[PDB]
Amino acid sequence: DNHLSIVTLEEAPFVIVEDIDPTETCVRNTVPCRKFVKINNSTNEGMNVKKCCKGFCIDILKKLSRTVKFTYDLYLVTNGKHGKKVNNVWNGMIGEVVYQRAVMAVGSLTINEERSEVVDFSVPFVETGISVMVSRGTQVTGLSDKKFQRPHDYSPPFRFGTVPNGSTERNIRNNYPYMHQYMTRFNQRGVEDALVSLKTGKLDAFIYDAAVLNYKAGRDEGCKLVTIGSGYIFATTGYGIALQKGSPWKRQIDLALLQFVGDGEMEELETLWLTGICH
């Protein structure tokens, strides 16, 4: 069969969600996408709500639907974000795949070792990694900067942090145990939350997904928040489409993606959705 259940997850600019045109039709570069929305927090009952979905990865999904020739029913993930193995039961987009509720997941989904053991990932279609955002003028190499691994070796000690309970926190917890302990008192609510702490001099550095920090830096008013050079990014990797283990679609999807980076169609999407006004 070539009709496919695809899960995604809102995260501008990669996936951007809008209510339906009131009319009930998703016009423009938006595609239909349903979302199962709960009735209250103490029942499993809900309704499937209709929304419209656009963005960098949605444009990807379009080209793949045309090149690889499938159709799809896109929905958004209600329980979890990208996918975390909680007591060995994945949630997120990964979990919708592993438990065969979707056959592929399209989104800002990072490719990591743990996920690859249970899903198959297409070739990466955008570079990401773990990166550092600072206010222009702060001198920082990258995550493995000594000003991060031994913070009290500098006076004043740097104030940096990340948004906990993600992959950045976990990766750091394993690789830099004492960096994890110290930056805990500097955990942030989210990205827009931590940008302001950067700009008001509360925080010295922000360690997070590199595509997301680049996109923020591009569209930062005054162009004063900046990320480190791409060469100092830690655990470099990328966003990819998750499929099922053994998926017969991975081959045509890989070829299709590498074709889009080859013939320029990917750089165009990047410039369309990702490239901003700074630099």
Partner 1 sequence: RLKIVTIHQEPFVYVKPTMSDGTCKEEFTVNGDPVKKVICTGPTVPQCCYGFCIDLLIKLARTMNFTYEVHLVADGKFGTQERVNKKEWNGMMGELLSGQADMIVAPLTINNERAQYIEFSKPFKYQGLTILVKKGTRITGINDPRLRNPSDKFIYATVKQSSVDIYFRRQVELSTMYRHMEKHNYESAAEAIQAVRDNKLHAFIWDSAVLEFEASQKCDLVTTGELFFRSGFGIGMRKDSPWKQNVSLSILKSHENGFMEDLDKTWVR
Ligand X SMILES: N[C@H](Cc1cc(C(=O)O)nn1-c1ccccc1)C(=O)O
x/- mask, partner 1, residues 229-268, rule CB under 8 A, reads -xx--xxxxx---------------xx--xx-xxxx--x-
State the Cα torsion 117-120-122-127 to the nearest 10°. Answer: -30
Q: Is 131 annotated as a binding residue?
A: no
Alpha-helical runs (H) found in the chain: 56-67, 92-98, 113-116, 146-149, 167-175, 177-183, 191-199, 210-218, 250-262, 265-269
3-class SS at 140? coil
Is 68 near partner 1 (CB under 8 A)?
Answer: no
Q: Residue 168 annotated as binding?
A: yes
Hunting for tokens 């950067």 — which residue is that? 198
Which x/- pattern, by CB under 6 A, does the window 35-74 give for ligand X?
----------------------------------------
- Could you tell me which stretch among 95-103, 123-131, 140-148, 249-257 binds ligand X (CB under 6 A)? 123-131
Q: What DSSP element (H or E) covers 35?
A: strand 31-38
Please tell me whether residue 112 binds partner 1 under the rule CB under 8 A. Answer: yes
The helices-and-strands tally (H runs, E runs) of the chain is: 10, 15
Which is nearer to partner 1, 36 or 270 (by Cβ)? 270
The annotation status of 110 as a binding-site residue, yes or no, is yes
Q: How far apart are CA 250 and CA 153, in angstroms?
A: 48
Choosing from 98, 209, 243, 244, the residue that interacts with ligand X (CB under 6 A) is 209
Q: Shortest Cβ distance from residue 174 to partner 1 (Å)?
A: 8
Question: Out of partner 1, ligand X, none, which partner does residue 110 contact, by CB within 5 to 8 A per kind?
Answer: ligand X
- Residue 130 CB contacts under 8 Å (≥ 6 apart), including other chains: 143, 168, 171, 172, 207, 208, 209, 210, 233, 234, 235
Q: Which residues bind partner 1 (CB under 8 A)?
A: 111-113, 116-117, 121, 123-124, 127, 144, 171, 174-175, 230-231, 234-238, 254-255, 258-259, 261-264, 267
Bind-site residues for L-glutamate: 108, 110, 115, 167-168, 209
